[PDB]
């Protein structure tokens, strides 16, 4: 085994085909599934995992009551193979109400964040032993991606971030050589409230995309240089904004540099990636809630804070329906390096009051080099006749 | 590992002995089972695995209701060991309602079919990648195999659909190389019609046995040549015919290069392969519904289209038990290629309406050159007992 | 891989020490466990498999009703590790309502009959595919071991009989290589009624301990030699007899050529061993019902058909707790080759009426050269309070 | 492989860092788990396992009723990958109520006690066989450490003792290469009473932390010599005790040579560490019950029997929710060996009423070097509302 260094374009991309749906809900309506929320996808150099937040419980049982709670003790990441639903033998990894998962070409590295609000531990976790920990350092929620860390040459970076949810806070980025801490750096450049990052690889370096949830519905953008630490920072140019909440497409503007200011507060998980001066990105379809997945190019969307010119919009989740958290993850192939993303299905609580509890299922996508047509795949299940 | 050749001559049939039954129906009036149907096997160098198309619900379960219904969002690709039953922790390995695998001695292929009946998509994943997609380019149910695809020195076949169902449509045969679609072949012959091919190596290349949907209720053959990608096709001679509908053995007649116009609408998907001028085929007992399955070889039946001398006749399933679709993989000894085939049990919806569901149970066979007796392997649920 | 050739002496055995329990009956009560009867062990030269027949169906569950009949299509052979209870997610390996397994040191052979009592199939199964098959020799309930077979040197042995259960039947000894049946010698010697064979490996040949359920109550023996395919046979001299029915310890006899006649209609399957003059043996506690289990050493009981004189006695179950059929396997350790054996613990129909089903959990038990305590360990399951 | 020799320096311990939480309670509300006692984790050299006692039922099932019992027949050693609940896949790896498992770098020991109280028997199965086995020696409840046991080049060590819990008892210590017990060590020292030790690699040696049952509130300490079998003991001199029950804290004392005689009667298995004189630590928080769980390290409680100078407390279970058994396990990382430890979680009987069963669930926690902060990782069932 050698260690992955992404040392590879980036395929081009047309578009999106499906690749993966696990139908959870669905399932879980007359078996035992894992409650859960946060999912995320990672793969080794053979084959895709996906992972999520359990909520210790499954969603037939008493316990599934009140699970609209994000931080609880009993939260643990489950992994599975990608499409293996999380059913009763599925491996909690580590205690976890927020984490990031990584394979660096030679074993898995999870960060796994427990413990109380003020004073919370990250564990770092490589081939499956415990080689690290550090304290919140803010003292207020210290918390990761909830997607794919980046491996390059056996140095994994993660981001992390303590503070206000609605003000400045303390983001650093952590460089880990077989789950040790090796370097932290903080936060630098013009972006002003990271969180939730979706990175990808970029040869020599590593790039994310992340949640503004402070002044911005425009998504800010970190990068790191994985060599000298060194990071910078900004904002998805593009005059179509990828959070939720955001202004409409007529209404709607950014920044290169700064918040765009515009309904700003709040925000989603999810991701967009650079194609020369064009973005590929992912966003709710309805403004204000999270509602429908489409995707789109926006053609000189990375340089032209004033393009608002999008081309090749998918629906991937029709906007009568509940969508989430999206991110990336990237898939080596032969030639190129290609970028892939999945879309948390939340149902339950508290938009939908008919069930006492809050879980997920998810619907993957991933890049394609061909042509595909259209559809929409969203969760399906019936609430209506699912246990009282 | 090498690539598969299958450069090997077939195995001598005097017939086929059980080789597997996951009895699907009955386990789940006492567990979490999958609702499926259009299952099929294929094997890998070493060992078989089953897959069927999920309908994203178990049996027991209030989404099962009105699973008749064969393409939603909501179906995926189901893949076991074989006689592994379809539990709450079988991999779904892509998103379909219509769907082709192989292995080509490496890796696995999937081709993979969902979206909108008039702009659906087919995925093609390689080595637990997507590599490829394409674009329904007659935009009316772009359809596939529903059975093992096959792969000769790296490049793997499969037969394509888009188009009416009872009328001309547009048959192509791609040729795909580590996922990679190389070249597209446009269905050439006298094959008027052709749906759901069961394909088969026969080496230097692969032959397939189709169902003509439309003015045959005899059977399409298509030949395939894998270096210079031609293709022939036909109809099989055999004046017993395959297909279902059909006419009884005494009023029924066929022709080697026509449909022949005999209760040809509709019809269900099988299987035959030849055996020098001999043809092996399954059907279902009954000529007019999917009941019973038998199998025998018609003496000159492969290359004269007068033969109606049946002999080595096999009830798989007997004529007041529910059949279904039906197809053929074949298996690599160690100086043979052999013959199998699997057959569909069909419970449910329409035809039986004490249940609001529609699922499958699978029996599978394989060509033997030793000597074998008789029964019959029906799907054993007692639907009057089931879960109600 | 090399082939398994047991050469090595048989080890030191002072009587037998727990190994494994699967307490089947007791999780099904709460959990989707399967029906099933007649199973064994058979080891890899890693780890140690459990097989059964399925009845098609778990406990929970409303096909469960009438599973005390032995031979229906639904039946399959369950294979797990030893100590997964079958589940749901067990592999069934092949249609069997009779079968016998082995591994020869690079692969599995399976051998599984099913199909009509009148003419029956038996399907050689071996490195994960159908090499071989064999119609009933005299069309009336082809059957073999229910245990594990015999290989050396790559030759597999299996004993199978067709005819009468209760007078002169046709018994045979397939060699098999690599799932190719090349030989068949006919029964021969002085064992007049041979069935379920517990066979183990006696280098350079194999032998078996068989259930004569004619007019024998002592067990016969068949010597199998595996170059010359030549066989001999006879009953275990030991005055203190293995079968059920039986007489008791006092009334009871034996003879080393011929069933000695005593309660000898039916029987049960059983097995001993050699150890010089001296025999290893099991068998149920009650005299005339399937009624608990014991080992006990006969000394000169496996030459002088007058030694009554047992030591070294290990009660198994209980008296008063079910028990059933019992088995040999071997288990090669560092310099020498150790026997064990497994129990089946019947509970349910005929015998008890409190439930609808039958079905088994097993109790298994290796040779040890060390020493050993006592203890009962029955199925434990209360049918008083089971499902419905 | 090579044996494991664990010639490397300890790391450096500040504190521990969550690590793994199973969630067993509550997910068995909703799903088959099973019941359970007396649960350990080991860790091959890639991934750690953990280990419990079942007994022979799932939760929600009529035989978990009276599971307050704590030798049975039914009991069995369960297995899975630390992180997988017991769900009906769980392998049973030995008949058991009790267990001591370790991995020498080449394959699996366990050391599995079962039988008559008067007459136990403990088998040893390594390498996935029946190597060895022992009786009972005084005739009195034979029984071992219930966590894992050590091997350094391949020979491992357990400790057992038979004879009263609370009076002097006849304690021996093992020492078995590949499953034969090749010698046997008896206790000695000023240790009076020794049970359930937990014990951990200190290269060239190993060393155990006890538990005294009869007058001992502090912990006993055996040392084990592995290359002649010598054995020293002592008790932990830390004034700050590990038993439960126990002095509180401004009462207590200790001794390094003699049971302290503080409330002696009793006591609960937990575990200590050395770290130069300084002495790792867990207890329960309640010093009379099984409430909460704590660690700590002690200044100098390693040879200062009179320091009670507390450093680096962590609360692992808050003292309002109960706890249980403990043990210690030893993970190597790339330059030092690491210790953890895994915390059983007891719920139900006879503590408490509101259900019928007592089962427990496992929290797990690492050393680490680098920093952590705070919070509580109980059960998190809730019996007001269980199964029934
Ligand atoms: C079958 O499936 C395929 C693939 O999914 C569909 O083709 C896609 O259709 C999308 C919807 O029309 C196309 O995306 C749109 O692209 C427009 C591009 O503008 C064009 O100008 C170029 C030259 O520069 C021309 O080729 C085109 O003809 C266009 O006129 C965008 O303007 C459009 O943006 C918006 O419209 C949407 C609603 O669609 C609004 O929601 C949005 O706010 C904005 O006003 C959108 O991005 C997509 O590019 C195309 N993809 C490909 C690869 O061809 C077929 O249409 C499907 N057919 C059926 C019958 O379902
Ligand atoms: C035990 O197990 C074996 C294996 O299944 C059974 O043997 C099979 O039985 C089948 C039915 O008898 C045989 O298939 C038939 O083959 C017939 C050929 O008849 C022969 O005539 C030729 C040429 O004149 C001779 O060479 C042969 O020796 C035969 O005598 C077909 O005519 C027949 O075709 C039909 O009959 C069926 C009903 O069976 C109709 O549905 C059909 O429409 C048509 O009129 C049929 O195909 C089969 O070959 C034979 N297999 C082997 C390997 O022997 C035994 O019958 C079973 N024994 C018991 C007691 O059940
Ligand atoms: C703890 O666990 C051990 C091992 O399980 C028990 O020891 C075993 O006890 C058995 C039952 O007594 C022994 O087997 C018996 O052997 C008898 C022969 O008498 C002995 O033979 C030699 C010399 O003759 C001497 O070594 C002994 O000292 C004895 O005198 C057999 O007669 C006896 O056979 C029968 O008795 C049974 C009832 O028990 C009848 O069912 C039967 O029909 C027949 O009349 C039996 O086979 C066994 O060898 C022995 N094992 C070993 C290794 O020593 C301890 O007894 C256990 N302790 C407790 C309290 O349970
Ligand atoms: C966030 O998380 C970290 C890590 O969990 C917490 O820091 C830990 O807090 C613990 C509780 O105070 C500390 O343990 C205590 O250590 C005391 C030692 O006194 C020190 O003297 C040293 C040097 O000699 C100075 O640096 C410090 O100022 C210390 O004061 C013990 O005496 C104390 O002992 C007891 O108090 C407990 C607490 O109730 C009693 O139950 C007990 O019986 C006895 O009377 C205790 O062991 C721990 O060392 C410290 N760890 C580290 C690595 O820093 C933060 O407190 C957390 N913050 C929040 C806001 O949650
Ligand atoms: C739960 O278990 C109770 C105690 O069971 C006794 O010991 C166990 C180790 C077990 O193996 C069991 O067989 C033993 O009887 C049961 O109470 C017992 O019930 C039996 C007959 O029902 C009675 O003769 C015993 O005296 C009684 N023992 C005690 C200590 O109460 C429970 O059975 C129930 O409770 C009984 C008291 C009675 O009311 C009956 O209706 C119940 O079946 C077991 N509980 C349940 C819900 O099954
Ligand atoms: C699910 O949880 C909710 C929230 O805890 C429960 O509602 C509470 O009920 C308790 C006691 O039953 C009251 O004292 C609280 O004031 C309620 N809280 C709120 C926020 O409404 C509810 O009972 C639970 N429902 C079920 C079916 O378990
Ligand atoms: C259970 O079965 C009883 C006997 O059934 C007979 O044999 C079985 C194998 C079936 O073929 C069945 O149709 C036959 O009647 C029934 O008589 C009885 O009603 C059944 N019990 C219940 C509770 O359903
Ligand atoms: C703590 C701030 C962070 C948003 C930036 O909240 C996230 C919001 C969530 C959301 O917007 O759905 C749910 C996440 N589980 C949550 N994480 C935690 C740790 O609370
Ligand atoms: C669309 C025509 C095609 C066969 C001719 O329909 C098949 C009919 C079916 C059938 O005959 O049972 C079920 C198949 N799931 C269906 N395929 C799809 C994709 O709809
Ligand atoms: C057919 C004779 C044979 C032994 C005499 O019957 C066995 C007896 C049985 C028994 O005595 O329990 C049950 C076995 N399942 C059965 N096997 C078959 C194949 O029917
Ligand atoms: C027999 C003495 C022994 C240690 C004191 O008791 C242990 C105490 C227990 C306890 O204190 O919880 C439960 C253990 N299952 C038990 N082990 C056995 C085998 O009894
Ligand atoms: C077969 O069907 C035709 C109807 O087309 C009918 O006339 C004929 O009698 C049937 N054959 C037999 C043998 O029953
Ligand atoms: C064929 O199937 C139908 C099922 O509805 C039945 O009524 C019909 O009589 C059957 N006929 C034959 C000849 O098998
Ligand atoms: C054997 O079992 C039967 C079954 O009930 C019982 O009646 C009988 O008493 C037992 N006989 C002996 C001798 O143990
Ligand atoms: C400790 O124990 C005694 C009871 O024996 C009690 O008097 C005292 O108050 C306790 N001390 C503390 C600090 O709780
Ligand atoms: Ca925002
Ligand atoms: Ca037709
Ligand atoms: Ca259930
Ligand atoms: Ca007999
Ligand atoms: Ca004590």
């Not at 515009?262 to 809630?289: L, Q, Y």
């Amino acid at each position: 085994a050698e260690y992955r260094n992404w040392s590879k374009p980036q395929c081009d991309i047309t578009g999106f085909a499906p690749f993966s749906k696990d139908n959870s809900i669905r399932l879980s309506a007359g078996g035992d599934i894992w409650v859960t929320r946060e999912p995320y996808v990672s793969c080794d150099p053979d084959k895709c995992y996906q992972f999520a937040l359990g909520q210790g419980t499954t969603l037939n049982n008493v316990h599934s009551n009140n699970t609209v709670r994000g931080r609880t003790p009993y939260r643990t990441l489950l992994m599975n193979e990608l499409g293996v639903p999380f059913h009763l033998g599925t491996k909690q990894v580590c205690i976890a109400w927020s984490s990031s998962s990584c394979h660096d070409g030679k074993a898995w590295l999870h960060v796994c964040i427990t413990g109380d609000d003020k004073n919370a531990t990250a564990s770092f976790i490589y081939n499956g032993r415990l080689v690290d920990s550090v304290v919140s350092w803010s003292k207020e929620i210290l918390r990761t991606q909830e997607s794919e860390c980046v491996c390059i040459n056996g140095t994994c970076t993660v981001v992390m971030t303590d503070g206000s949810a609605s003000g400045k806070a303390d983001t650093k980025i952590l460089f880990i050589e077989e789950g040790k801490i090796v370097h932290t750096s903080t936060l630098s450049g013009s972006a002003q409230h990271v969180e939730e990052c979706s990175c990808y690889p970029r040869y020599p370096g590593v790039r994310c995309v992340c949640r503004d949830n402070w002044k911005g519905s425009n998504r800010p953008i970190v990068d790191i240089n994985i060599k000298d630490h060194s990071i910078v920072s900004s904002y998805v140019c593009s005059g179509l904004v990828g959070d939720t909440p955001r202004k409409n497409d007529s209404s709607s503007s950014s920044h290169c540099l700064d918040p765009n200011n515009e309904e700003g507060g709040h925000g989603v998980k999810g991701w967009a990636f650079d194609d020369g001066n064009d973005v590929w990105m992912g966003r709710t379809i309805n403004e204000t809630s999270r509602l429908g997945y489409e995707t789109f190019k926006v053609i000189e969307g990375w340089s032209n804070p004033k393009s608002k010119l999008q081309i090749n919009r998918q629906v991937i989740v029709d906007r009568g329906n509940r969508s989430g958290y999206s991110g990336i993850f990237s898939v080596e192939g032969k030639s190129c390096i290609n970028r892939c993303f999945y879309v948390e299905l939340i149902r339950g609580r508290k938009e939908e009051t008919e069930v006492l509890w809050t879980s997920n299922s998810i619907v993957v996508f991933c890049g394609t080099s061909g042509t595909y047509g259209t559809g929409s795949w969203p969760d399906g299940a019936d609430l209506n006749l699912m246990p009282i």
